[PDB]
Design a protein around this ligand. Sequence first.
Ligand SMILES: c1ccc(CNCc2ccc3c(c2)OCO3)nc1
Ligand SMILES: c1ccc(CNCc2ccc3c(c2)OCO3)nc1
Ligand SMILES: *[C@@H]1O[C@H](CO)[C@@H](O)[C@H](O)[C@H]1NC(C)=O
Length: 352
Amino acid sequence: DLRLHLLLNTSVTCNDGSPAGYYLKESRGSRRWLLFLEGGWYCFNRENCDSRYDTMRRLMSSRDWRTRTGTGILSSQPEENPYWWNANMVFIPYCSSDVWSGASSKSEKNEYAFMGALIIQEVVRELLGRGLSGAKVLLLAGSSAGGTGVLLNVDRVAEQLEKLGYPAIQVRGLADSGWFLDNKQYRHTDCVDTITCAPTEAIRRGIRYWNGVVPERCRRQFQEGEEWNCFFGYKVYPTLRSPVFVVQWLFDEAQLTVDNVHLTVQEGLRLYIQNLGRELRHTLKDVPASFAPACLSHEIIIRSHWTDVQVKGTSLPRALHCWDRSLHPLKGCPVHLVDSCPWPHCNPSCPT
Ligand SMILES: c1ccc(CNCc2ccc3c(c2)OCO3)nc1
Ligand SMILES: c1ccc(CNCc2ccc3c(c2)OCO3)nc1
Ligand SMILES: *[C@@H]1O[C@H](CO)[C@@H](O)[C@H](O)[C@H]1NC(C)=O
């Protein structure tokens, strides 16, 4: 079990003004620290944030959060977690609805606070008095909206630790299921409410509503008004300096949802699905640390059975171990693992 701590700086809040926080299980014999960012979509105007508050309130508030069990990469049992079972474990709940990008407080002009980027900074700060000052590696991990949050925030955590006087701690990222394409959709709707708004248009509006922040080098490339581009992995990744390992299902269910596809198959859709896998594979060609199986799924790293899937005979925990060794090719220890077969479940190890 990981134990809840609410932030001592109570100006750093969830959407409704309640304090943000983190869950922690220390391993005092270890100098490795895993900070995991939870996912769960986003909201981008008053009307859709109000709805989310009624039926997804744990993603907007800490009022109803004392312990949580660590699973997958957050498990302390080597049977479930062959990679980092002895590490210090931190789960950061997603209560800002902003893809971890926001820097805006609730105020006379703002019904909600969007503080995701500041929540990450404050967690790192408070952890530095609880053992993180002695770390050798800080791995910032996350799933779905939390995976995109890794891409947006990993270089900011690295800069923070350097400016606080800890330049020797190695900061790295692990982004799971947060590598999306701004691709052509299977069917199209003009952006008129929540359901009809494609991600490019919803994120453009969100950035303005949240006062969202993107990494500096990416921001300098795309410039004012085009920051939405930095929420797309293939565009932001080449601007990052920290090492980042990318986990992405080739036929991700959230990607298919935003593409207006429902699987529940004739030539047009067959060609669309095969083209999506081909395009995703293409964007990972020059990503040296990656794991991308040919499956229809969403998320993996905190699932208890995350050990089961394999690409070219190598599991995800093994690939992450090989990544560690590479940061000290390697015979029998690969780090770039992308499937090449063209249809969901052409890999027999895909989840059922
Ligand atoms: C501690 C602190 C705050 C709360 C929430 N209380 C209801 C509420 C008030 C104002 C709001 C809001 C919700 O959403 C945006 O503005 N609970 C426990
Ligand atoms: C659990 C389930 C579903 C989700 C949705 N992921 C958010 C998202 C979607 C499209 C995006 C994006 C972020 O940034 C680029 O385009 N998260 C967690
Ligand atoms: C509390 O958090 C706010 C928001 O980032 C920051 O401006 C302020 O300096 C923090 N105060 C302390 C004492 O850490």
